[PDB]
Amino acid sequence: QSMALHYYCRHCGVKVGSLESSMVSTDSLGFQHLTNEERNDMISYKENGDVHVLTICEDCQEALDRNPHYHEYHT
Ligand SMILES: [Zn+2]
């Protein structure tokens, strides 16, 4: 199944790596004994990857490419 790092966007807070998590249970960490999804990750090695990366989404990339560093701070 299509699995990798969990992508959460820098600044705009969009989930860039979580859409098909409904059937692709690789997004949820097997904490203890929650759902069947957690039961699957309950293996002695996080199958979900243990990866929470903050990256640029399409939107922010365009904030990037269309605006120099996506505007300035204040001055
Ligand atoms: Zn973004």
Curated annotation (Swiss-Prot):
A motif (YXXY) lies at residues 70-73. Its cofactor is Zn(2+). Disruption phenotype: Cells missing this gene prolong the activity of sigma-F factor and do not fully induce the activity of sigma-G factor; sporulation efficiency is reduced 50-fold with most spores arresting in the engulfment stage (III). About 10-fold increased sensitivity to DNA damaging agents, 60% reduced chromosomal DNA transformation; plasmid transformation is unaffected. Partially suppresses DNA damaging agent sensitivity of recU deletions. Partially suppresses DNA damaging agent sensitivity of recU deletions. GO terms for biological process: regulation of gene expression; sporulation resulting in formation of a cellular spore. The gene is fin. Signal peptide: none annotated. Induction: Induced at 2 hours after sporulation onset as part of the sigma-F regulon, followed by further induction after 3 hours as part of the sigma-G regulon; its concentration rises throughout sporulation (at protein level). This is Anti-sigma-F factor Fin. It holds the Pfam family Fin. GO terms for cellular component: cytoplasm. It is found in: Cytoplasm. It comes from the Bacteria. An anti-sigma factor for sporulation specific sigma-F factor, by antagonizing sigma-F it allows the switch to sigma-G factor and progression to the late sporulation development stages. Might stabilize or process Holliday junction intermediates, although this may be due to polar effects on the downstream mfd gene. GO terms for molecular function: metal ion binding. Zn(2+) binds at C9, C12, C57, C60. Keywords: Cytoplasm, Metal-binding, Sporulation, Transcription, Transcription regulation, Zinc.
